[PDB]
């Protein structure tokens, strides 16, 4: 069967940069290769067919090269909207195998998160659980740290992080962290604090409340 080995798995680049993605076939495919752009939670979009042919209505900054075994998709001047995963596909013959994919993230000026905390609603406490959420908004880079403190004690293994897929207009991320406990364990503590560390911060940012 025919392999398609993609390179690399992921890359960061500045707006205006030249990006090059490589696919490699284990056998002579001649010219039978197609490129797809998949944005998250959207269907793949056809970019290139027959290795070098731009599909109608596709931006001209996308171009394709290659023959036989070695193939290249190129973005000449990277745009914010270009965040996505890109795929080569052998289009002949069946089975048509797809490459592993290439995640493209935009590199951008550094931005410190805006931090928020949210106490649990009274209607949730009714059913015997408490969820305390901390929101970090519109920040870059991705790598950030949310530490929970409960009456000034550091918390471990009782919170879960979820990350926004990079914004396609201003290239930022958002992050939610959720502290979950039994209302019995909630109601035995006073102050709920959320401590944030990022490259945009030179000193940890704490956001807190007192139970009622």
Asked if 210 touches other proteins (CB under 8 A), the answer is no
DSSP per residue, 142-189: S--EEEEEETTEEP-SSEEEEE----TTT--EEEEEEEEEEHHHHTT-
Identify which of residues 77 and 143 has a Cβ nearer to other proteins in the complex: 143
# residues near other proteins by CB under 8 A = 47
Find the binder of other proteins among 118, 142, 155, 168 (CB under 8 A). Answer: 118
Find the binder of other proteins among 7, 22, 76, 164 (CB under 8 A). Answer: 164
Query: If we measure between CA atoms, which residue out of 44, 43, 27 comes closest to residue 35?
Result: 44
The Cα–Cα gap between 15 and 79 comes to 6
Find the binder of other proteins among 2, 11, 13, 46 (CB under 8 A). Answer: 46
β-pair type (45-49, 102-107) = unpaired
Asked if 142 touches other proteins (CB under 8 A), the answer is no
Find the binder of other proteins among 22, 52, 63, 97 (CB under 8 A). Answer: 97
Asked if 52 touches other proteins (CB under 8 A), the answer is no
Please tell me whether the peptide bond between 81 and the residue prior to it is cis, using omega within 30 degrees of 0: no
Asked if 140 touches other proteins (CB under 8 A), the answer is no
Identify which of residues 119 and 141 has a Cβ nearer to other proteins in the complex: 119
Tokens read off for 205: 């940012």
Asked if 174 touches other proteins (CB under 8 A), the answer is yes
């Amino acid at each position: 069967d025919i392999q398609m080995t993609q390179s690399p798995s992921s890359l960061s680049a500045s707006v205006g940069d030249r990006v090059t993605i490589t696919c490699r076939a284990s056998q002579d495919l001649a010219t039978d290769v197609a490129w797809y752009q998949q944005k998250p939670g959207k269907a793949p979009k056809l970019l290139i067919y027959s290795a070098s042919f731009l599909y109608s209505g596709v931006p001209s900054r996308f171009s394709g090269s290659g023959s036989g075994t070695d193939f290249t998709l190129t973005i000449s001047s990277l745009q914010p909207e270009d965040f996505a995963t890109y795929y080569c596909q052998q289009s002949e013959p069946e089975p048509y195998t797809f490459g592993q994919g290439t995640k493209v993230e935009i590199k951008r000026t550094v931005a410190a998160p805006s931090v928020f905390i949210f106490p649990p609603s009274d209607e949730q406490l009714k059913s015997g659980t408490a969820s305390v959420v901390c929101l970090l908004n519109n920040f870059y880079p991705r790598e950030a740290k949310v530490q929970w403190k409960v009456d000034n004690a550091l918390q471990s293994g009782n919170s879960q992080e979820s990350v926004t897929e990079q914004d396609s207009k201003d290239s930022t991320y958002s992050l939610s962290s959720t502290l979950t406990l039994s209302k019995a364990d909630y109601e035995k503590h006073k102050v709920y604090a959320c401590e944030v560390t990022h490259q945009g911060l030179s000193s940890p940012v704490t956001k807190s409340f007192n139970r009622g």
